[PDB]
Amino acid sequence: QEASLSAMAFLFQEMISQLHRTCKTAGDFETKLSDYGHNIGIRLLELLNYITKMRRRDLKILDILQFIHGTLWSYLFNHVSDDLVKSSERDNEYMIVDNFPTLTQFIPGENVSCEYFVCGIIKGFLFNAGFPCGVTAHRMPQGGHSQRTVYLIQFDRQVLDREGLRF
């Protein structure tokens, strides 16, 4: 079943509103909201009880990432992510593109940090996945979309090494 984007939009804004009052520096806010997202992220793999029963049994990096952008967003935000870009400058860094985060939308143009909570969900998922990430969102590229933002999913060498060994 489902619920109203309005309530979620509402709960979230209050969540952010509250978060804004505690934290003095933008940095603590970004990292803290992300942690909030992380706990949600760890939880998704946990729910486990297209038929990728990846169950701790090893699967390459791209398989999870490609599953994650197409499968999860529609499951979460309710819209297949936009693009999944394997960087072309550093071997651990990847990129996942979103047009309009079904979440961080009502929030006005500049403020990137609110965006991080959605990105944190990605981090928690991968960390539990057994492949630590480092999702840091960004509101640019903005081709024909005021808010299209891309989350920077930088990985830890351990995933880099496990993968290098079994291509």
Partner 1 sequence: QSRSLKAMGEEIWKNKTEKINTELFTLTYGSIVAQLCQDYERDFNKVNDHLYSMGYNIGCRLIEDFLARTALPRCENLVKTSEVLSKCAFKIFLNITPNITNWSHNKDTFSLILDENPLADFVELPMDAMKSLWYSNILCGVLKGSLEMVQLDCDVWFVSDILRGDSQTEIKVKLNRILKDEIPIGED
Partner 2 sequence: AIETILVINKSGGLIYQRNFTNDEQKLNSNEYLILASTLHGVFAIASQLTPKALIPYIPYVGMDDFFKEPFTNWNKSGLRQLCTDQFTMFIYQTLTGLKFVAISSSVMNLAIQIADNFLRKVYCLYSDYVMKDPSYSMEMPIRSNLFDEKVKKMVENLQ
The binding site for partner 1 (CB under 8 A) comprises: 1-8, 10-15, 17-18, 36, 39-40, 43, 47, 75-78, 102
Q: What is the DSSP letter of 138?
A: E
Between residues 137 and 159, which has the closer beta carbon with respect to partner 1?
137
- Sequence-distant contacts of 7-11: CB under 8 A, at least 24 apart: 8/103, 9/103, 9/105, 9/106
Of 10-18, 80-88, 115-123, 150-158, the segment contacting partner 2 by CB under 8 A is: 10-18
95 binds, among partner 2, partner 1, none (CB under 5 to 8 A by kind): none
- Tell which residue, 123, 69, 71, has the closest CA to residue 99: 69
Q: Crossing angle, helix 26-47 and helix 5-22, to 10 degrees?
A: 140
Each residue 101-130 as x (binds partner 2 by CB under 8 A) or -, in order, gives -----xxxxxx--x----------------
Please tell me the distance from the alpha carbon of residue 115 to that of residue 59, in angstroms, as a whole number: 28
Using CB under 8 A as the binding criterion, the count of chain residues that bind partner 2 stands at 17
Chain residues in the site for partner 2 (CB under 8 A): 6, 9-10, 12-14, 16-17, 20, 106-111, 114, 146
